[PDB]
Design a protein around this ligand. Structure first.
Ligand SMILES: [Zn+2]
Ligand SMILES: [Zn+2]
Lengths: 57, 11
């Protein structure tokens, strides 16, 4: 499995695309990156601990 | 939560 059980910079959006939009954010739990506008976050709202759907759902 | 932005190529 691609994880190697390690935390890496991994673009995993609900979009199931590794594509980069104008804006992306990183999950504090598993390090994965997402388009914030898909996750309900913007560069204005970036929290200290954003949890991703793969972690929080 | 780490963050990044882009718009065009690096030229
Ligand atoms: Zn997306
Ligand atoms: Zn996560």
């Amino acid at each position: 499995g691609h994880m190697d059980r390690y935390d890496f910079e991994v673009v995993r959006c609900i979009c199931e695309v590794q594509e980069e939009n104008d804006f992306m954010i990183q999950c504090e739990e598993c390090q994965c990156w997402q388009h914030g506008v898909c996750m309900g976050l913007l560069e204005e709202n970036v929290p200290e601990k954003y949890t991703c759907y793969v972690c929080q759902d | 939560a780490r963050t990044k932005q882009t718009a065009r190529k690096s030229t």
